[PDB]
Amino acid sequence: EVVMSQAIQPAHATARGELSAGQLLKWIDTTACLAAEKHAGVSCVTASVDDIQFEETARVGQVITIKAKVTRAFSTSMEISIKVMVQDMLTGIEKLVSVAFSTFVAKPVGKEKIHLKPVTLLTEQDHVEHNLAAERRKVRLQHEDTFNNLMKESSKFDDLIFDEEEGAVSTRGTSVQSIELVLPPHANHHGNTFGGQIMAWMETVATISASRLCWAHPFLKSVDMFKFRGPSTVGDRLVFTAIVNNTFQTCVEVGVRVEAFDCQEWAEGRGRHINSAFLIYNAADDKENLITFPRIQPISKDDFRRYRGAIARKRIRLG
Amino acid sequence: EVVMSQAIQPAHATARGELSAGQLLKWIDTTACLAAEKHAGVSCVTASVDDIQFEETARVGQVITIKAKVTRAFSTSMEISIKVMVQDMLTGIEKLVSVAFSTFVAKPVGKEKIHLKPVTLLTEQDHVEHNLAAERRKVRLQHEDTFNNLMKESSKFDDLIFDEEEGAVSTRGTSVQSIELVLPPHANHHGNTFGGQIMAWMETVATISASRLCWAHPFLKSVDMFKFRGPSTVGDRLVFTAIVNNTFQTCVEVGVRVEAFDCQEWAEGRGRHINSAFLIYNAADDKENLITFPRIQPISKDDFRRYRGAIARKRIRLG
Amino acid sequence: EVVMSQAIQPAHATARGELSAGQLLKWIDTTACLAAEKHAGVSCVTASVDDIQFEETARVGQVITIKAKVTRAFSTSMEISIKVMVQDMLTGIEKLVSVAFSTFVAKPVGKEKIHLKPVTLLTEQDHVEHNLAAERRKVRLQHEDTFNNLMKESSKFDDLIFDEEEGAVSTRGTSVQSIELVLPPHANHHGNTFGGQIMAWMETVATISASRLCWAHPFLKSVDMFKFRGPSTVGDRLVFTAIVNNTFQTCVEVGVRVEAFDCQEWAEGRGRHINSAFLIYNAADDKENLITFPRIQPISKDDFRRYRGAIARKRIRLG
């Protein structure tokens, strides 16, 4: 249905000439939102994003193509499926970057209820996807509890200490904080902050965190399914906090938390929690070899919860 | 009158360290608009752009200088002349990039008619340009019909087939589609989409199309005179469609079509045609040699119309 | 209090892979503004900036960290102190970039007076800084007169001529003019232009001016304390004029003037003077050696005033 093509320029690129993952997340979300709004005919905001995995890391000079489609509309929400291809403009070769799902919610104005049409079903796949959407919705809705329950099976005893020869390090020097002011290009015409914009900012903070652990070149491997818990509008300040949670050989998990404050809330210290997300990075050296991250040694009560958290999340993924 | 200077940074650059043509079009249009508004004292939108040819391709590290002036004001419209120079900041050498004309229309608010002053005429050239503007206006106004009539002299018989040894290729794999959401930085303070912004987006889609034919490094040589057919505002989605129309040795023509939809129109499938444009590209290889494009083999009814179209347009240019 | 972290990407970089000084000024100002607004709970605009000196020039691939804090609140204004660190992401090494002060003014809406709380004082330094703020405020307020008085001691006789073998050059070919349209991302949600945005634009014009003198690679060394003389809003055009004022061996002073016009004022030729600033640059050659600038030969009445001006400013700095 909706198709976006973007040539990767220096402006979208990192130090290493690779597409910023955050930039890609923003583009995915924009395409998805437009697919939702083509179905709904009103403005739509990002409700949640499913697990997204990146199969390639696109480079300056290549062209990204993003296709998004409404697979099913429920009451106020719809599931959007997204496919991202990359094409090399010298060899003409195309590769799959990512296949993903995002959920959008229609935001009518202002006291009118919205009536979402039935999505048109033509091919076999259209009908299969329409069923699968109800299943995928169940996973979305049970996700918080699934994790919360796995956490009950983890130790909760903070006595874990690695040997001196293990070479474990603390995560303390990998914490990162940043802040962004939400401006009119960051929000739709009703002033609601784009979810893609939040994701792009998230990822940029998170990558710095990964960098402070390996001192190499991180690239994003995946982001876990997460929910936008509440609205953000123009004028908000979004405060980002990220830290490494755990390592698993060639993977590191960085968690990031996003809090919103309007000008008043900002002075009064009381913000809203917009979302939290968990990003897995790999990293390469200058000879392009995969880096093995050190073992992590949790110290604080928070350190430990996040060490177990990354584990619970990893096991939920592998399944 | 109005002067803009821009140092070319990585942010404005392509993969090859060259100024994005689309970025240059946006800058030209901004300077021109400011010249129009300095004369009109109200907000002004891009009505049309004349043929624009690029004599050099500027590079990261050089400085662009753009001078625009109102040459003549009519009733609601005025002709703006633009000159673009590039300076190399290591050798100090300046070169002409482009000499161009654009027409702007005053958009008063909201029920008041606008009274355009007579442009001040001082030098010989001021008086010559004032006359030439009336002529150039005639060419602008007769342009659609001039083309439409040349098309009557072309074959209209779709039987054209190149030999197998000719090595002609179809244009099918060079089509490109993209989409842009119009946000507040993309429009003036009355919400009207900048024409320069549309041009920048146009060119970025078009260059991808040229790339899919040669698998090299395109650079823009010219854009044909074209008209903005109707307004666009914040909240519109602009859908771009581009394809190669024809080749002429070292030149390829890419056409691009721009349709606007507000949120309602977007869901109801009924958009407005904003403009269509036709861009000529050259391309270089990695040893910096001009590429010769393959011969084009039209297949569909559309293929043929655009094959003839590029010819009609080329002949109108050469004259 | 307020912490911003930014990884330096190609998008923020110059031709030479170095962070744009203007980009850094924008980031400093944003962080500072957020510190002011965290204290005031209303929107705050940049009133003035103190002397700022840059100790390092950060590069693509490094991470900037900016910490800003309210040191003292007066009646409507507050002093903000800022510290900028840079971290190399390969060696993990951190270096001080800059320590600075900026003054913000609360802009309540619209007929309500603002009541600024007393800043909380905890550490020794908190109490020292609170006193020092009253002193630093005195320097801010006496700055225009201090300069004006030094100028009385300078020659005012325009007879200064350097020998032919001195190799002095005129500044005439280093003047630069540019223009920027103020758009919604350039202003807070009340439409007031960000001071940081003006600074970023200032610096980009000024660096071109330095470039036209040495034909090398300028990097910003410092900006003098200056005042924003009046408000700017969305829709303004900001006209920048810059020229080299004087040279002092490895330093060159570039002055820049900023005038604002709304659409009406723009057509009627009557603008507002927003600020003027004076920036000192060094420059390196391609083998990374410091460039020695030529001696400057003033010619016009303006040339001479600015030659003396740069001197007065230099002496005020050294003290």
Ligand SMILES: CC(C)(COP(=O)(O)OP(=O)(O)OC[C@H]1O[C@@H](n2cnc3c(N)ncnc32)[C@H](O)[C@@H]1OP(=O)(O)O)[C@@H](O)C(=O)NCCC(=O)NCCS
């Ligand atoms: C998403 C949101 C609307 C749902 O909030 P809520 O308090 O749970 O309200 P409800 O439980 O009544 O759910 C409303 C709809 O959202 C859906 N929803 C709730 N949680 C979801 C999740 N984790 N994943 C997918 N859909 C979800 C529900 O299925 C429901 O769909 P339906 O109306 O078609 O049946 C709300 O959390 C929100 O506004 N989030 C922020 C949206 C936003 O502003 N995004 C831009 C970035 S800030």
Ligand SMILES: CC(C)(COP(=O)(O)OP(=O)(O)OC[C@H]1O[C@@H](n2cnc3c(N)ncnc32)[C@H](O)[C@@H]1OP(=O)(O)O)[C@@H](O)C(=O)NCCC(=O)NCCS
């Ligand atoms: C340009 C526009 C105002 C003229 O539309 P129109 O339906 O042809 O109306 P008119 O025929 O009455 O022409 C109005 C004026 O535009 C001029 N005009 C029309 N077509 C033109 C063209 N191809 N080139 C130059 N000027 C043109 C006319 O000469 C006339 O000038 P005048 O009033 O000084 O004598 C209209 O097409 C439009 O709004 N285009 C979009 C403008 C815009 O929003 N640009 C931003 C990018 S979307």
Ligand SMILES: CC(C)(COP(=O)(O)OP(=O)(O)OC[C@H]1O[C@@H](n2cnc3c(N)ncnc32)[C@H](O)[C@@H]1OP(=O)(O)O)[C@@H](O)C(=O)NCCC(=O)NCCS
């Ligand atoms: C800064 C500004 C508010 C002060 O203007 P003014 O005509 O001098 O008015 P006042 O003399 O009554 O001063 C008002 C306050 O600004 C302070 N102020 C004035 N000049 C100052 C300077 N050079 N440095 C620091 N503070 C200054 C005063 O100390 C006073 O503080 P207080 O109320 O807490 O005691 C005014 O110049 C302005 O609006 N500047 C533009 C602000 C702006 O829009 N910035 C964004 C970029 S355009």
Ligand SMILES: Nc1ncnc2c1ncn2[C@@H]1O[C@H](COP(=O)(O)OP(=O)(O)O)[C@@H](O)[C@H]1O
């Ligand atoms: N104060 C902080 N400093 C650094 N990183 C943080 C901080 N708070 C949260 N984070 C990161 O954001 C993630 C999400 O935070 P949160 O939603 O509070 O859940 P949890 O701490 O249980 O993981 C954390 O896992 C962590 O990686």
Ligand SMILES: Nc1ncnc2c1ncn2[C@@H]1O[C@H](COP(=O)(O)OP(=O)(O)O)[C@@H](O)[C@H]1O
């Ligand atoms: N569906 C499409 N797919 C790819 N490119 C297109 C498409 N439609 C239009 N274009 C490009 O945009 C140009 C302008 O289109 P249009 O105004 O419809 O005129 P025409 O098709 O007669 O040239 C076309 O020449 C073509 O190059």
Ligand SMILES: Nc1ncnc2c1ncn2[C@@H]1O[C@H](COP(=O)(O)OP(=O)(O)O)[C@@H](O)[C@H]1O
């Ligand atoms: N017309 C101009 N052309 C080029 N540069 C200018 C021009 N006007 C001002 N500038 C630069 O801006 C600076 C500030 O200008 P202004 O506030 O008028 O003070 P002064 O001219 O006394 O220094 C000048 O020092 C100069 O370097």
